[PDB]
Amino acid sequence: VETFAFQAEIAQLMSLIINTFYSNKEIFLRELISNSSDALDKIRYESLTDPSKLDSGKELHINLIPNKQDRTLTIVDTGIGMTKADLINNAGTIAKSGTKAFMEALQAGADISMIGQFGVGFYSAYLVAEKVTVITKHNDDEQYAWESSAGGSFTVRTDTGEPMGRGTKVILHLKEDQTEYLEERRIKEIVKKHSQFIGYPITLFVE
Amino acid sequence: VETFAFQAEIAQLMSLIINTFYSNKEIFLRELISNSSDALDKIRYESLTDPSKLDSGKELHINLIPNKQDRTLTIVDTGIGMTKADLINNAGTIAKSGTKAFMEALQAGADISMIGQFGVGFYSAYLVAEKVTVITKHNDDEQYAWESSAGGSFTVRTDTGEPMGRGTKVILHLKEDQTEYLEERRIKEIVKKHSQFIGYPITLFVEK
């Protein structure tokens, strides 16, 4: 298990997301589904010139998996996935400018719901999750598990458990008071409200 | 000059964009600036592992160039650009599956303004333009010019004209009744409304 420090600005944004009073927490789902949609666009585009890129799975979809026993909400996509380098480097220098701009926007009166306009929508997961695990598989690399309970660090390890073929699984280990996001009617409402017209099928799993 | 036929679905999308009554045409600028921003993110991401990727130009910006004499609005970016193969792939879009999903969404009550969510935002240019010319230069290919007045075809040719170093120029040949998009105050209003949080400087050029 390798341990890494978040880029300073990402650590600052994470503490802002965890500590700022903001009731409209439900936007985390919109942001994650948006990232899933973008990753799906990427593999679909690559497959136009090289169809073998879909040998790891032809279905391009998003699955929402609530689990009340584990207190987890999992967002699965069969997108392009991330290599070990992207998985690490995403929390590095690339995200510095967008994070810096977002925190400046917030100081100027912008809303936390605008996070996605700064390319850092992923960190909205910390509005509802105490810990986030990212399982990912890109065609050019092995399966890796990224994990962080914030605190300025994250870990990356090889994931040998259950191979996924290709894509990303975002496992949200929900805060004790955020279990409404495990309720079928609540998830349906949020999807209809914020992600009604996504370019890929969204399947809400039953418990 | 090579001439290509659009696939049936992308042809149907362009025809819908041209013929459907939809007054909120100004979203074309948000969509093009969004594509420019994404192309700029791509080159900036690649510049970190390989700094030589910026030898073709270090400045990362978006320029809006109205020209009332030519009746054109040009959107210039110093993004990653597009290869010839990208241009032939419906100007780097997931046009086939994107159109299919977008058409299905429109039938389910979605608005034309949601086009960009389907990876076909570029074709919103046809809300205001009778013809679109795309001049592009990717680090891994030569400079090319893509062009289409819709009508089921597009052309791709090598562009030996003024080099751009790296990036994309989208030249909108405006419809006769869409000249408001050449007005300084109109462009400023649209940029403020739909693109205030763009991560790259947007420069609106002055005329005369």
Residue numbers in the entry:
A (entry chain B): 17 to 223
B (entry chain A): 17 to 224
Verbatim from the authors:
Here we report the investigation of the role of protein flexibility in the modulation of binding kinetics and equilibrium thermodynamics of drug binding to heat shock protein 90 (HSP90). HSP90 is one of the most abundant proteins in the cytoplasm of eukaryotic cells, comprising 2–5% of cytosolic protein under non-stressed conditions. It is a ubiquitous molecular chaperone intimately involved in a variety of pathways, including cell signaling, proliferation and survival, and protein folding. The N-terminal domain of HSP90 (N-HSP90) contains the nucleotide-binding site, which has been the target site for drugs interfering with ATP binding and ATPase activity. The unbound N-HSP90 has a highly flexible lid segment comprising residues 107–14137.
However, the complexes with the loop binding compounds 1 and 6 exist in two alternate conformations after L107A mutation: loop-in and loop-out, with increased mobility as indicated by higher local B-factors. ITC experiments for compounds 1–20 reveal different effects of the L107A mutation on the thermodynamics of loop- and helix-binders. This suggests that loop-binders do not change the conformational distribution of the protein upon binding significantly, or that the thermodynamics of the bound- and unbound-states of the protein are similar (the available crystal structures suggest that the unbound state may be in either loop-in or loop-out conformations).
